[PDB]
Amino acid sequence: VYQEPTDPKFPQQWYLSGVTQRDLNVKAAWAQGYTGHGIVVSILDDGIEKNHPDLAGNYDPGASFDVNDQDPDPQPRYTQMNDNRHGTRCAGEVAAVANNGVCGVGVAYNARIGGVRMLDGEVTDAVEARSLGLNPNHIHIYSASWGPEDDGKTVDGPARLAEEAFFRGVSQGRGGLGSIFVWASGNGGREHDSCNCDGYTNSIYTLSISSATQFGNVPWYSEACSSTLATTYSSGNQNEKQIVTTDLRQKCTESHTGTSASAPLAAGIIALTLEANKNLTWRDMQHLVVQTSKPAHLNANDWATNGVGRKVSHSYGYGLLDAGAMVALAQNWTTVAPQRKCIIDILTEPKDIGKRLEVRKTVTACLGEPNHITRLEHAQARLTLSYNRRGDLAIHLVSPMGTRSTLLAARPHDYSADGFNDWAFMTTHSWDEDPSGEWVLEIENTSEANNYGTLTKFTLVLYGTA
Ligand SMILES: [Ca+2]
Ligand SMILES: [Ca+2]
Ligand SMILES: [Ca+2]
Ligand code: NA
């Protein structure tokens, strides 16, 4: 009985609905009656053309602000090069108006869309915090298609205020259910960057999203890491189609690309999911993604089955998001139990790394205590170590159930001698596994060079329930 969009460009939005069973299954969600009505999404970027003909109808001033110039109007700054078109492109993917004879449609075409202009100027910790913490009781989902430079040699993440914003967000946002923070995993594929060296994507508070090309391949710009949760389609080679969305100066583009285009699609799907169940907590949402994402059709060299029978890849997380499945499961979802946190400091003495180091430890996961965990969610391996050439290292963490998460792959451009200072490598690959038993940390020098260093701290942090 449902009638799909009549927008001129909808037919080119192959990732929304296609006759090749290779899409995000969004129409199936629309058919179930979910379009994002009542949900508020904010694009933290370089601004949003609120008067765009395909955005005006859904624009929401309450979900917007201009942090760069300190005013409530997020309108982009116009320049000959059209530098500030990025946010507007991301906004359209989420909530471009449907059936209005203009361009295409957003995943959640009935959602309210806002924008925080915060990338067009000096991006400080304060700027980030004010953006991430904007109207936490009005805005439901925040979408961020930006982050530290992807040079493949830096390790960076949120400073204190931003961290506090994230924490206040998942704790108090949405009336206590927790703000949903969607993040683009990065464009450093060519520089061999790792998204675990990015504190925004690596955070447990954000749903880090990767990309897949139309033919189901890992895009050239893709960054692999264990912190990524799932994937949505984006651009690839010139024979593959790209993302169709709203563009600056009230135009329509068919060439929105890279990691930037994936997060917004995920944000939209999540918007449909919240409409299906407004009581989902920020953790419930991550559970739904893990459970409903599909690996099938996606090509990767590292698909592996984890302790609970789910396929995972460092390039895709649990696979392609499935809107229809997300909204279906949301309806019968029982809120998960309170989050427990079990801290296990492993080292009793510094360990020399040399060519290879292996650290084994049998844990009880806080058995007999209030934070006993039998069903894992995120896991972090907080490491502190020194090394002469950081990029030559590769670090892996194996769960008692045999799931091997690569916390860090070699980064050839990383010649840093500063090592890692209590860096919290995170993995989503052992989600739902029982964490008790022997864990193994492996650190290896992937180069033939005679490198040296010392691992001074290894704290295993488990989040989950019983
Ligand atoms: Ca302004
Ligand atoms: Ca439209
Ligand atoms: Ca990166
Ligand atoms: Na994350």
Side-chain angles (χ1 to χ4, degrees):
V1 64
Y2 173 70
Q3 305 308 108
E4 70 179 14
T6 53
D7 304 71
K9 300 294 193 178
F10 175 60
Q12 287 108 83
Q13 299 183 292
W14 56 278
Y15 42 96
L16 297 180
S17 189
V19 298
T20 186
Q21 287 75 301
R22 302 292 186 296
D23 56 55
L24 300 174
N25 200 32
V26 175
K27 183 173 174 181
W30 294 336
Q32 289 179 63
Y34 303 108
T35 66
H37 165 73
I39 305 305
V40 185
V41 175
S42 183
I43 309 297
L44 311 190
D45 211 272
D46 62 10
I48 181 174
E49 193 171 72
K50 63 186 191 293
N51 57 317
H52 189 294
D54 224 22
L55 298 175
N58 286 334
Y59 182 69
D60 174 5
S64 306
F65 201 81
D66 180 344
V67 176
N68 287 143
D69 288 341
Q70 253 71 205
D71 67 67
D73 188 347
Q75 194 75 27
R77 171 171 65 84
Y78 298 86
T79 72
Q80 241 182 308
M81 283 167 84
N82 289 307
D83 307 72
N84 306 300
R85 69 189 185 174
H86 193 257
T88 295
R89 288 182 174 206
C90 294
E93 294 181 80
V94 179
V97 177
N99 309 312
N100 69 332
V102 183
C103 203
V105 295
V107 167
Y109 60 74
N110 272 319
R112 280 151 82 192
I113 187 81
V116 176
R117 177 169 179 265
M118 45 80 66
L119 293 178
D120 194 18
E122 214 198 315
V123 181
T124 61
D125 181 41
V127 162
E128 286 172 24
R130 296 189 71 215
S131 304
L132 293 163
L134 178 63
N135 243 321
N137 290 306
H138 176 67
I139 295 166
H140 303 113
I141 302 159
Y142 298 76
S143 181
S145 296
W146 49 270
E149 186 175 354
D150 296 313
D151 56 14
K153 58 179 162 176
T154 117
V155 176
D156 197 356
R160 292 168 191 293
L161 292 176
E163 291 192 69
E164 290 180 334
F166 275 131
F167 219 134
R168 298 172 69 78
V170 307
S171 298
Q172 298 133 49
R174 286 167 67 222
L177 300 174
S179 299
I180 301 303
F181 296 110
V182 183
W183 223 277
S185 55
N187 277 333
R190 196 230 265 109
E191 320 320 311
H192 308 88
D193 201 9
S194 169
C195 36
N196 279 357
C197 288
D198 176 329
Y200 301 86
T201 48
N202 195 56
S203 171
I204 68 174
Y205 314 132
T206 66
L207 293 94
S208 187
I209 306 295
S210 284
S211 305
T213 76
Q214 172 175 28
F215 303 156
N217 293 306
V218 180
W220 67 269
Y221 53 81
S222 175
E223 302 189 25
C225 67
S226 60
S227 72
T228 296
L229 199 60
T231 300
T232 63
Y233 284 110
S234 187
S235 67
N237 64 42
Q238 305 190 201
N239 303 86
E240 294 173 296
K241 294 175 194 166
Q242 310 188 323
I243 306 312
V244 176
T245 184
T246 48
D247 204 9
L248 205 58
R249 299 174 193 282
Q250 311 179 63
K251 295 172 190 160
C252 183
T253 179
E254 292 175 53
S255 35
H256 184 31
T257 72
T259 190
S260 292
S262 290
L265 292 174
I269 291 181
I270 291 168
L272 304 181
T273 306
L274 279 184
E275 179 179 1
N277 186 341
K278 299 177 174 296
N279 278 175
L280 293 175
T281 67
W282 68 278
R283 278 169 55 243
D284 284 326
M285 190 59 64
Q286 288 192 38
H287 274 279
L288 292 187
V289 172
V290 167
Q291 283 197 27
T292 63
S293 295
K294 311 292 192 301
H297 296 156
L298 261 43
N299 305 303
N301 198 313
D302 68 334
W303 280 115
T305 308
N306 66 3
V308 298
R310 288 194 275 242
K311 297 272 228 266
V312 260
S313 165
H314 293 67
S315 285
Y316 305 127
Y318 286 83
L320 230 40
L321 290 185
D322 183 328
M326 282 283 284
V327 292
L329 188 56
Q331 298 174 69
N332 289 154
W333 192 262
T334 294
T335 293
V336 297
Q339 184 206 63
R340 300 182 182 200
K341 187 182 187 181
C342 182
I343 303 176
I344 310 153
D345 219 5
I346 317 285
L347 300 186
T348 53
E349 45 152 38
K351 260 55 185 305
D352 181 66
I353 300 172
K355 237 301 175 183
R356 186 181 134 97
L357 167 64
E358 205 189 70
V359 176
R360 290 172 178 276
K361 172 71 169 187
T362 300
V363 305
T364 66
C366 291
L367 170 64
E369 312 171 19
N371 36 187
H372 169 49
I373 296 172
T374 57
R375 197 192 226 213
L376 190 71
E377 282 178 2
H378 315 82
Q380 304 172 311
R382 306 190 69 99
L383 315 182
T384 298
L385 63 85
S386 48
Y387 209 65
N388 61 300
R389 223 255 174 195
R390 200 167 59 192
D392 290 353
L393 300 168
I395 298 173
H396 312 270
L397 174 71
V398 185
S399 68
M401 291 177 98
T403 301
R404 198 180 175 83
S405 298
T406 291
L407 305 185
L408 180 68
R411 294 204 296 161
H413 298 307
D414 187 6
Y415 57 172
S416 172
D418 301 319
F420 288 105
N421 184 31
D422 187 31
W423 187 260
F425 297 93
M426 189 276 273
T427 178
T428 59
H429 293 210
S430 285
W431 195 278
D432 281 329
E433 290 181 2
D434 183 311
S436 56
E438 177 178 72
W439 284 82
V440 184
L441 182 75
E442 313 178 3
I443 300 183
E444 62 176 310
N445 174 17
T446 68
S447 144
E448 290 295 354
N450 276 269
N451 296 320
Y452 54 98
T454 306
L455 172 70
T456 56
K457 199 191 83 303
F458 166 26
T459 310
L460 180 62
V461 184
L462 314 169
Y463 293 93
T465 66

